[PDB]
Structures are given as structure tokens and as C-alpha cells.
């Protein structure tokens, strides 16, 4: 048995979303489907439970009134529905299954992969690539640090790559940070020997599928 969920979503404030959870096994046989939410950089929380064989649902105090839980026996699926999305509901929602034959309250055997929901008001935009040129002073023989700047793109993710994957010695790709305008931004930097410059080249390949965009650029010290 395996729990399969829906894909990611990028909606707008005030809209509504539905997340589906389907079991590759036979059905929900005296089981329950618990829902767990994890906002980024936060601990896991608890939504509530739906018991398909009973047709009874229990909710947590905090989220009573804003979520509706649905189970369809024919296809053996569980549904979550969000109403009046705020800007702070960006999170990941997991399914959990707890066997019921032994007892009503029980641990979580099997977990779904999770459904990423982003709630913001922005337009699908391609990233902007800028060269964070290497320092002329650098470490003066020790090492040289140079990277590319990726900003004003929506939505994430962006798969930065260097020299088409040839170089992976010291690349650092920081997790993106949300700007005030609503557009994400991140940068990736690679550390190379100082003498390496002037003889061998660097390219920061950048990919952003949601707009189907391919952006490449060359990094070189101003001199």
C-alpha cells in the first residue's frame, strides 16, 4: 500500500485549493487519514482526522472552520479543502494512515510525500541573472570566490548549474529568500583557485521550468 498525493499549487490570495490523497492499496479499511501541515522552518502541526469507514471527521481547535475534509469510498481518496487563503498559509501538507483494528488512537504507519501550496499575488516571471564578479584582491593566491545572482523570479524552484555540471567542487547554492515585492531571489557561489582565472572558464547555467526559461551567462573579473 502506498499513499499518493496531488502536485504543487501556486494560487492567489482569497482563492481556494483542494489537495487529494489516494491509496495504491485496496481501500481504507477501518483506517484513518490524518493531515499534517508544516510551514517552512517550523515544526509539524495537526489538521484533523477523517475516518472513511465511519464518515466522521475531527478537527483541531485552531483550524476549525477553515478546512473541510472529504473521503470518497469509490476511488478510495481523501480530500482537503482550504477556504479564504491568507498569505501565511504557504506550507506542505502530508497524509498519515493509522491502523484501527487494535485501537482508535494509534501511531502513523505510512506517510505521503506532501503537497506544496504557495499563496501569493504575483505573475509568472523569468529570473534575472547577474554576475557577482570575482574579487580582484580575492585571497591573493589562496582562493577566489565568484558567483551569479538570481533575483526577481517567480515561482521557485530554479536549478542553477555550473559549466553544465562539470564543476561541483565548491559550489554553494543558498536557499532563496522572499523579497518584499513578492519575487524570490537566491545566489550561488563557487570557490576556485586564484591561478585558475584567466585560463579556464565558468558559466552559471540557470533553469526555470514554470516559465520555460533558459538563461546562461559568463562571469569574468572586470580587470
Amino acid at each position: 500500500v502506498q499513499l499518493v498525493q496531488s502536485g504543487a499549487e501556486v494560487k492567489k490570495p482569497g482563492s481556494s485549493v483542494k489537495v487529494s490523497c489516494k491509496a495504491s492499496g485496496g481501500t481504507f479499511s477501518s483506517d484513518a487519514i490524518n493531515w499534517v501541515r508544516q510551514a517552512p522552518g517550523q515544526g509539524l502541526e495537526w489538521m484533523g482526522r477523517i475516518i472513511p469507514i465511519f464518515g466522521v471527521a475531527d478537527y483541531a481547535q485552531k483550524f476549525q472552520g477553515r478546512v473541510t475534509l472529504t473521503a470518497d469510498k469509490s476511488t478510495s481518496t481523501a480530500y482537503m479543502d482550504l477556504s479564504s487563503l491568507r498569505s501565511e498559509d504557504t506550507a506542505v501538507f502530508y497524509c498519515a494512515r493509522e491502523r484501527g483494528d487494535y485501537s482508535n488512537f494509534w501511531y502513523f504507519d505510512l506517510w505521503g510525500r506532501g503537497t506544496l501550496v504557495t499563496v501569493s499575488s504575483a505573475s509568472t516571471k523569468g529570473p534575472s541573472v547577474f554576475p557577482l564578479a570575482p574579487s580582484s584582491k580575492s585571497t591573493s593566491g589562496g582562493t577566489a570566490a565568484l558567483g551569479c545572482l538570481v533575483k526577481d523570479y517567480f515561482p521557485e524552484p530554479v536549478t542553477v548549474s555550473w559549466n553544465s555540471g562539470a564543476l561541483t567542487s565548491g559550489v554553494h547554492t543558498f536557499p532563496a529568500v522572499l523579497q518584499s515585492s513578492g519575487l524570490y531571489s537566491l545566489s550561488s557561489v563557487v570557490t576556485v583557485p586564484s591561478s585558475s582565472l584567466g585560463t579556464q572558464t565558468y558559466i552559471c547555467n540557470v533553469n526555470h521550468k514554470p516559465s520555460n526559461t533558459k538563461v546562461d551567462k559568463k562571469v569574468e573579473p572586470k580587470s
Binding site: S30, I51, D101, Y102, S103, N104, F105
Partner: peptide
């Protein structure tokens, strides 16, 4: 001993 509900039933109370 322990008591397990047969296939097709759910336990209303708590604990084995």
C-alpha cells in the same frame, strides 16, 4: 492476551 477486531471493523475505545 490481546484482542484484535476482525477485518472490516474498527475499535471504538483506546488501546490494545
Amino acid at each position: 492476551v490481546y484482542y484484535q477486531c476482525v477485518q472490516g471493523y474498527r475499535a471504538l475505545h483506546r488501546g490494545p
